[PDB]
Design a binder for this molecule. Structure first.
Ligand SMILES: C[As](C)(=O)[O-]
Ligand SMILES: [Co+2]
Ligand SMILES: [Co+2]
Ligand SMILES: [Mg+2]
Ligand SMILES: [Mg+2]
Ligand SMILES: [Mg+2]
Ligand SMILES: [Mg+2]
Ligand SMILES: [Mg+2]
Ligand SMILES: [Mg+2]
Ligand SMILES: [Mg+2]
Length: 322
């Protein structure tokens, strides 16, 4: 059974799922801008609950919140949103990648002792017991790596997660930076004994060469085109490019291993971002209703079957997280 912020749910009750989104999110440092960028709890709850209701209207029953521990993760808030709407939400345990995470703390611990073991204890505790003493458990482990390599800092997390995976069976979802390291992540995790059927390599839509995806898929892991809607936003390709690669893969029979999400942020922590003019088109379709309203219908018109769409949105999530 999957562990959600309101308790365990049977694989069968997960339904259509968005495997990677962010109810709330803040880049590391946002907490230091608390005076002019405070969290308006009432406003966030209202906004997030309306977004949640809109997903329910689309038949989406579950969302996997992939927010790292150092990026504004708030299991208690996720629980309020879930209790107020009925939307099921899984939260994560893990730290962001070296280039953008709050890395000083664990680099410090690592200099004094066994950081891998401490990260392992944190992950195991949050998965099996609860987070911050709330009784709310993490339903997934979030791992993330840099573009040019899975750094030594990042590896600490990959190794701790592999062990927690082996001991608990918990799912693992990841972040790949700028369309690279997908194969390395799959290889590393599987060589450490992690169950390939419970691993989702993320941001794979970030690379538009299908050879890169097939190689990653050779490891038996699943891969997610989880930033659908974010187009040409520094690196990120266009949705047209994503769909081209996605239909090529579906035609090669990979439906059992493909997942789809937006990586949307429902409410920002810190001061809300003001998107400049030149960037409006890049974020226009970057919201959690995009796949349901635009992408799936477009796949169907391209020849993709209802069975294939259901495999990606309901089948795979049930197997991976349930
Ligand atoms: C890579 As992220 C925490 O902005 O989704
Ligand atoms: Co990410
Ligand atoms: Co994300
Ligand atoms: Mg800090
Ligand atoms: Mg295993
Ligand atoms: Mg299994
Ligand atoms: Mg359309
Ligand atoms: Mg059209
Ligand atoms: Mg078309
Ligand atoms: Mg058909």
């Amino acid at each position: 059974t999957a562990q959600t912020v309101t308790g365990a749910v049977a694989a069968a009750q997960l339904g259509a799922t968005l495997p990677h989104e962010h109810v709330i999110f803040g880049y590391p440092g946002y907490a230091g801008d608390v005076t002019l960028g405070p969290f308006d709890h009432a406003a966030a709850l209202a906004s997030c609950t309306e977004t949640a209701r809109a997903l329910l209207a689309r038949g989406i029953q579950t969302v996997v919140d992939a927010t790292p521990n150092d990026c504004g993760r708030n299991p208690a808030f996720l629980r309020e949103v879930s209790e107020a709407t009925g939307l099921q939400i899984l939260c994560a345990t893990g730290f962001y990648y070296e280039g953008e995470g709050a890395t000083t703390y664990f680099k410090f611990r690592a200099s004094l002792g066994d950081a891998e073991s401490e990260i392992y204890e944190m992950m195991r505790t949050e998965v099996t017991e609860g987070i911050a003493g709330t009784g709310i458990r993490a339903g997934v482990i979030k791992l993330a790596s840099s573009r040019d390599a899975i750094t030594p800092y990042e590896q600490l997390f990959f190794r701790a997660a592999a062990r927690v995976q082996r001991e608990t069976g918990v799912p693992i979802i990841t972040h790949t930076q700028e369309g690279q390291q997908g194969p390395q992540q799959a290889e590393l995790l599987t060589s450490l004994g992690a169950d390939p059927a419970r691993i989702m390599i993320g941001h794979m839509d970030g690379n538009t060469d299908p050879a890169y995806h097939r190689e990653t898929l050779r490891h038996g892991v699943s891969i997610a085109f989880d930033r659908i809607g974010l187009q040409g936003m520094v690196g990120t390709p266009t949705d047209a490019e994503r769909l081209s690669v996605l239909t090529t893969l579906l035609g090669e029979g990979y439906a059992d291993r493909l997942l789809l999400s937006h990586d949307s942020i429902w409410h920002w922590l810190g001061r809300p971002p003001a998107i400049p003019e030149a960037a409006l088109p890049a974020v226009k379709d970057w919201h959690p209703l995009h796949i349901s309203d635009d992408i799936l219908p477009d796949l169907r018109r391209r020849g993709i079957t209802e069975e294939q769409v259901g495999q990606m949105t309901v089948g795979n999530p049930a197997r991976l997280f349930g």
